[PDB]
């Protein structure tokens, strides 16, 4: 039922600011107090700041000049501001919920947005259909895959039929080509399946602004 | 601003019982700290075990108690099951800020011994066309999380041009990973055969291609 839904993906370039609503549903801002907490690539948790029910906020001392957290109400977003962003701030970034006494604990936690402070050159990933060299045995199991090559910066989606399959999904983690990232996907299906059915990869990535469908054919 | 420590990592089998430390770099972790403990589940996903007055939220394990022993908070973890592997946080309360500790990671041994199920994927006739060529080896299912790969043309083996990733958790609690060989649309067309060898506790599995 609780769910504290968080925006997109966010390139952000040295000493320019970050945005992130978390809209929250299955409970009201004006029980439940909304925190903000973040995690480096290279370290645990670091606390940010609060946003209690009554409206009051807190924040870790060395942020209070350059942190915002503020909410509506009627709205159900909290909706965290921070500026003069440095490359040390690329994390992880996430919104948690927590109420009074008997409910005082970090319970639900937002999926977190992934923030990357950088003043590198945004590259959109190249998709590659990767269909098996040899053809399948009458009567089997194929695995068919997907490239998601040379990109910049994290993270990537990848689907199968728009969401269709999952079972028999794949989504490995990314690996770093120079300065650039590349994964791989696959889904394994029935050879009655494919190729007589369609099966296709949708790859995304939102900082560069590219949505592409591979259809993965024979050979 | 005060610094709150933790043991970087416990290892553990299942069945054990635990206990894991949050120290205050500003005295004794009092009452008024209000400590909690937080879980960290594979794939950045967090949820709250034990809250300020040593209350669980409803569905946590009875298995997981907060408490203090004498001068530090402490998270105690009766009978360690394998679900419990995770990273533990615990956060203190200053008067007007909130501060986490470092983290510490619990590894669970005992789990059962899986073998990795290997695949070799050709490049795409579109990848050729771009005069490059990346042959993708997917590892899949294993257990421990230890792997190593080696790449071989014609037999030969080759350090140039392979890339692999860290083994890290699946949706069933067994380890993934993917190591790529990207090479020239012109080597691809050269060649006749190639090689991904997994090695996994001493047993190599291969899967191999022939153009
Ligand atoms: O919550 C955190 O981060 C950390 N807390 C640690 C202590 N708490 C245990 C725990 O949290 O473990 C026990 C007390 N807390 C109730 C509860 O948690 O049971 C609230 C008591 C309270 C005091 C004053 C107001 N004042 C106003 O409304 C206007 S005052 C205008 C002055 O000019 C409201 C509520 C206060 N905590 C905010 C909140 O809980 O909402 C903030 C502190
Ligand atoms: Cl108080
Ligand atoms: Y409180």
């Known amino acids: 039922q609780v769910k504290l839904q968080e925006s997109g993906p966010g390139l952000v370039q040295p000493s320019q600011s970050l945005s992130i609503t978390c809209t929250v549903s299955?409970?009201?801002?004006?029980?439940?107090?909304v925190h903000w907490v973040r995690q480096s690539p290279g370290k645990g948790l670091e606390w940010l700041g609060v946003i209690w029910s009554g409206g009051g906020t807190a924040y870790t001392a060395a942020f209070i000049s350059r942190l915002n957290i503020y909410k509506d109400n009627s709205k159900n977003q909290v909706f965290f501001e921070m500026n003069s962003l440095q490359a040390n701030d690329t994390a992880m970034y996430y919104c948690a919920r927590r109420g009074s006494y008997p409910y005082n604990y970090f319970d639900v936690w937002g999926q977190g947005t992934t923030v990357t402070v950088s003043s590198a050159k945004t590259t959109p990933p190249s998709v590659y259909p990767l269909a098996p060299g040899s053809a399948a045995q009458t009567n089997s199991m194929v695995t068919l895959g997907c490239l998601v090559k040379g990109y910049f910066p994290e993270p990537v989606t990848v689907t199968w039929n728009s969401g269709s399959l999952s079972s028999g999904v794949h989504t490995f983690p990314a690996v770093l080509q120079s300065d650039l990232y590349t994964l791989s996907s696959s889904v394994t299906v029935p050879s009655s399946t494919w190729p007589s059915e369609t099966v296709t990869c949708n790859v995304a990535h939102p900082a560069s602004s590219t949505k592409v469908d591979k259809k993965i054919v024979p050979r | 601003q005060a610094v709150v420590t933790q043991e970087s990592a416990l290892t553990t089998s299942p069945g054990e019982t635990v206990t894991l430390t949050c120290r205050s770099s500003?005295?004794?972790?009092?009452?008024?700290?209000?400590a909690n403990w937080v879980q960290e589940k594979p794939d950045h996903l967090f949820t709250g075990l034990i809250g300020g007055n040593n209350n669980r939220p409803p569905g946590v394990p009875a298995r997981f108690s907060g408490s203090l022993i004498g001068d530090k908070a402490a998270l105690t973890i009766a009978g360690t099951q394998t679900e419990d592997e995770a990273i533990y946080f615990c956060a203190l309360w200053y008067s007007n800020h909130w501060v986490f500790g470092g983290g510490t990671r619990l590894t669970v041994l005992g789990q059962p011994k899986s073998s990795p199920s290997v695949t070799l994927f050709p490049p795409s006739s579109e990848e050729l066309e771009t005069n490059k060529a990346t042959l993708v080896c997917t590892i899949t299912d294993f257990y421990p999380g230890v792997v190593t790969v080696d790449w071989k043309v014609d037999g030969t083996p080759v350090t140039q041009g392979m890339e692999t990733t860290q083994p890290s958790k699946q949706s069933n609690n067994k380890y993934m990973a993917s190591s790529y060989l990207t090479l020239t649309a012109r080597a691809w067309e050269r060649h006749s055969s190639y090689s991904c060898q997994v090695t996994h506790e001493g047993h190599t599995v291969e899967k191999s291609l022939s153009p």
């Open positions: 500003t005295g004794a972790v009092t009452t008024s700290n209000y």
């Open positions: 299955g409970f009201s801002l004006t029980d439940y107090g």
